[PDB]
Amino acid sequence: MILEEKDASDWIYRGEGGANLVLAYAGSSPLFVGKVIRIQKARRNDKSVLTSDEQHLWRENNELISSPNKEVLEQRYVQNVIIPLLGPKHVDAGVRVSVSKEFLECVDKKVTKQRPLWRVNAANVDTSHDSALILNDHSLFSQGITSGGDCISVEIKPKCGFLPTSRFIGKENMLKTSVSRFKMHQLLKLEYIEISEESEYDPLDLFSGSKERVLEAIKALYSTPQNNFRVFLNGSLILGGSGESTGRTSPEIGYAFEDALKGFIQSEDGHRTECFLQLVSDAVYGSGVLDRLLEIQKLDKLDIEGAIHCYYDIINQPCPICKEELSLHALPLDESLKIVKEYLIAATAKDCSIMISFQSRNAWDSEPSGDYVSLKPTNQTFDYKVHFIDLSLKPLKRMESYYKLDKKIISFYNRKQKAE
Template sequence: MYETDCWMDVTLTKKDAAGWVYRGEGAANIVLAYVGSYPPFIGKVMRLRKAPRNCALAMRSPSALNAHEHLLWKDIDQLIGSSDSELACQLFVEHVMKPLLGSQYVDAGMHVMVLKEFLEAVERDVISKRPIWRVDNAKIDTLCESVLLMSDYSLFAHGAQESRSCISVEIKPKCGFLPLSRFISEGTAIKRTITRFAMHQALKLHQGEIALISEYDPLDLFSGCKERIYKAIVDLFTTPQNNFRVFLNGYLIFGGLGCGAKDTNVSIAKAFEDSLKSVIEADAGKCTENLITLVAEAVQKSRVLDRLLEVQKLDSVDIEGAIHAYYEITCQQCLVCKELSDEQAKRFSVFHSASLDESLRIVKDYLIAATAKDCSLMICFRPRREGDSGSEYNNVCLKSTNQTFDFKVHFLDLDLKRLSKMEEHYELDKKIVSCYTEMIEGDEKRKKVTNLQPS
């Protein structure tokens, strides 16, 4: 196993491209997992930056933090000293998110130099595995000089293959609280009673991104109550979208690669049940139920979501407040207040009369919280061998089968949210609330018409 500093002098070439397989992707990056036999790469995943296919140069990520971001993160020398946006993201995880969420739960990874030939070879190898619409939109950015290498937390052990099977569950928890900010307007007050996840589902359905609205409620997952946590996992399993995936020995067995998964039907559920039999001892048809129990107990026992919730709640003023602080930092006319009457704008005067340091704190806390609301949680389980009396890991026991599992928990996808996206966050927030409100009003009208019709 290479230590971190050993990778500093390594450059990946074309011959190193073999053995990397497609694991998934988001809007900005593609993730590959290593399944080969070269010892330094075993137990690793690699994240590569994407570039828009038709305008790669025009839409490249910023080469570094801009002047306002230097001001925002001025207390973190390593971060503001970075010359590349990818390196800045890694340093953000290392110096901001890791201390907040706990070093035992976060791996910032390491940057490894690569040649263009390596990236081109990987691009050819994985293109057939990617969703067609993703391929049409973007490709691997072959002009990058480095990639991010991290431990593969869908595997229990790293650095060497072992005989014991393991199963890992990846969850996107989403925002686990209802905002109470006094800066939420009367027109968007529904945010205080309906979760962001539920409202966003309406917009995704309207835009054709999903076929069915999920019953998943993040408040259940964050509740600390085993029964509610269990319900949350069941709801995620029923409509996984891109919020729930399961891996067996590092290979995806449930959920989507690079896009949302289909809603779980009888055929998908049976195939998944069958795939669990090698790890979970249970009566016929009970493996899935037992896995969901394992996940619920691990979430409750680890209390790791308590940490995540604390970080999410750094956003105490909501985007409807933070956007005003953003305009103060960037020395722009506040476009939000411009659309308000003088009387309406008065409630936001506290932001426009605040000190620069206070504005920076508000926006920094908002962006950190935004990362915490959009991250993933990976829980990896390994059956404990008979005779193992102790373990350095947490464990949960399936009472129905008397099977004990060691488990580990890690946070993933802790990317730095860019200051330049604040206005987009504000506009998306308005669109989400508007779409949900229209859906509810439409449902109420249809109910009235139905009730008026003669029976």
Template sequence: MELTLTEQDAAHWVYRGEGAANIVVSYTGSSPSFIGKVMRIRKSPRKASTLPGVRNTIALSSHERLIWQEVHKLISSSDKEIAGQLYVDHVMKPLLGSKYVDAGTHILVTKEFLKTVEKNVDSQRPAWRVDVSQVDKQCDFALLMSDHSIFPHDGQGSSHSISVEIKPKCGFLPLSTFISEGTAIKKKITRFEMHQALKLQRGEISQRSVYNPLDLFSESKERVHKAIKNLFTTPQNNFRVFLNGSLTLGGLGGGAESTDACMAKVLEDELHSVIQAGDGQCTENLFTLVTEAVQKSGVLNQLLEVQKLDRFDVEGAIHAYYNIIFQQCKVCKELNKEQAKAYTSLHSASLEESLRIIKDYLIAATAKDCSLMICFRPRKENDSGSSYNTVYLESTKQAFDYKVHFIDLDLKRLNKVEEYYELDKKIVSCYKQMNKIDDGRNEDAKLQGPEVTNQQGSEAANLQGPKVANLQGSEVTNLQGPKVPNLQGPEVAY
């Protein structure tokens, strides 16, 4: 952290986007030290619970230091932001592969730099983000990283690039024996699909996504292609497209509405500068490129292995959590003696075993919530000296360099485990409740259809059929919730 950014440097950093904890800005100046870089600047709540000028610098709690005791640099860090960077560097990078993970470096910044950046970017931030958070001007450093939405200027390949950011989510169905009978549906329906029901009920989304994470992780070219196309159809906060580092499709400060014909046309037109396909074919070719890169790189196989470190599910991990914090298990307290027997083995486990369960659970939670950035650029003809991997687009006879990086590999805190457990219960309960409602509607439709046809003939059926379909289809969809931004948006692409 030798370099220090001052007030005079602020004008060269422009808003790229933000998530719950950080604002991301990208560099537009001419300094070789920062070209092709982005910076994560920590945020703080506007209604701080601590006194002005005082912030919590405790990186890890005493229980967390037990969990991560083998990562010496992490447990000795003095600030939670530094701890986060060390976690990526020493925990996630070895698991996911050093070539796919950029932990970044910290750089010193002055309070004046932060004040000026905040002044410059506030007009571009979503209003609801501005209302609840601000730049943390008590923090004297920021995290500097490569901009993974573009290629570095190495003189090779095209100057144009396309990048796609995907938030894969959990790619498997849990099999843990600690999943109760009441939540056994988790073994059949993906967490992503069930969570959509809760988000819809809360008004965080206006319609459910058609994306299925199991398709993306399937290793079937057809299913992977389908997953990419479905993400494009309903991006929410799970899919973004950048052209030369500028957002073309998706949301910056949170979620995005479903892709309509106008959005699709804009993307199609933008892609013409990179993909040499006919009108209406560029977007489809982009799906093919992403599918090929996902399969050729094998990164999702590695990600899935890390996600599967969660062998006990949160319904098992919660018991290990109470072992670690040396408190009576609140979950078992609500069960009868017969039900509590199912978790006896967890509560009789050693402290070391409980620590391992929670450590693996938290690592898996990071892997389930991270994003994947895949960047492409057309390879120049007769260029055989590129250091990047290549995919070939048969339909346009174009070769593309591509690079893949995992981003948003945030350290999940121990004190969140109880929240994760409660959220899990809400997700399952809401899905089951809404599914019963849907089943009821389906039964009504079955009863109404044949009766109308038998009693009044085909003409009456034709008159009433579309009306019933409209009430149960698009009209119901429009009534299911306001179109508001997703308040749980992730860190944006960088």
């Protein structure tokens, strides 16, 4: 009920986003076996729980606005906003837990060394929170170690899988119409020395509903995981960046990963990787869990270039974009809230990741799961579960920047295009 300083030694690095630092449990209180603990970071970058405007916007959802702390905020967002929309099956809201400041200071220091320096430069554990999330550790197949034996699990951060169709995209940005944001964004990150080569992954393939472009995408992901692909053997990273995007999959890494699957994917040395990929493909496509996610993403109906206007209507600032639509600004406040609301939900949808956890089917289940892929090649039936993670609520103020970022993206992509 309260994690104290001595508990710190029981949690071990697992990874981090920009916002939270996630530790896997290494101790043995039934309380925490198979759980991860998600700890909010204090960005020196960004500087109660909800702003004025935000209370307005999330008004529909009172449970949100009357939240004591940010931990409890996420929880309710996930529980009341996300779940009805994504289903409770594959989403879990987390269980709050009290933490002492010492514990957090303690954990922070204990893991510093395993964190990417740039992450550290950017934020630490926000030692002023009294709360933290305990989640199930989806890199292990099911909650209470009755282990159905080993578990390979794969995290994918799909990002956005569709092209805008909006009536509100500038004349110069019409390219957003053709080229996925992911692909356009690569060029910039590359420019900002945030990645070391363009990724081969195209979300359009992943979300395309085409079994075959889906496989294509999984292969991309494998080749250039950046921050989009990770693979855990029993809770241990065996492919992908640790709390950051990683580099192209060299032969050295490739080999390590190949080696890492022995026994789980039961094929000839050097063939487990292609089987595993195929396996991953079939679980994703067959589960059709993507479509549902996509539906949420598509709640960005008008595109930042659309939504951005509503933002300013909502925060009661004159619109900086229009200078000296006849259309969007004619919207009842009520209608505008909706649009901006759904935008931020779509935001969430766009940046979450799926984890799929694998396991050799087990002819002892008290109820035979309904999800399994059957690997032709190796004649192995795997059971899988899907879950969505990192379903954060996006700060309303962020609309300003969403706009500028997106503007930046499209302009730089246009510039590099003119290079003909």
